[PDB]
Structure 1
Amino acid sequence: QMVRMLDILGDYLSIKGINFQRLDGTVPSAQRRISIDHFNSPDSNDFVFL
């Protein structure tokens, strides 16, 4: 519900070493399209999507 908890999980996964992607209200629609097309690609190395 809160993007600050999204920041907490994103920093946790960044220092963990897990390829993560994020989507919230601050992200513009072009980068949202980039994140969705990267996550839905068959050769995606992303594991967790926030």
Structure 2
Amino acid sequence: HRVLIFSQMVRMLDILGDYLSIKGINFQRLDGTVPSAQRRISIDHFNSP
């Protein structure tokens, strides 16, 4: 399985990103701080076979 995780706060997204960084899980991220080019890059990277 692959999982999306939705949050109302981007600071809680930072907390989960650090949790997966010390945990060691390949994660990708999207919020309002990420510009549209890196958003397109991340969505295409997650959807690649």
Q: TM-score under structure 2 normalisation? A: 0.85
Which is richer in strand? 1
Which structure 1 residue ranges, 4+ long, deviate > 6 Å from structure 2?
none
Unpaired runs of 5+ residues, structure 2, are 1-7
Unpaired runs of 5+ residues, structure 1, are 43-50
SS of corresponding position for 1:20: coil
Matched residues, number: 42
Question: What is the percent sequence identity of the aligned residues?
Answer: 100
CA RMSD of aligned residues (A): 0.3
* Higher RCO (CA < 8 A, seq sep 6+): 1
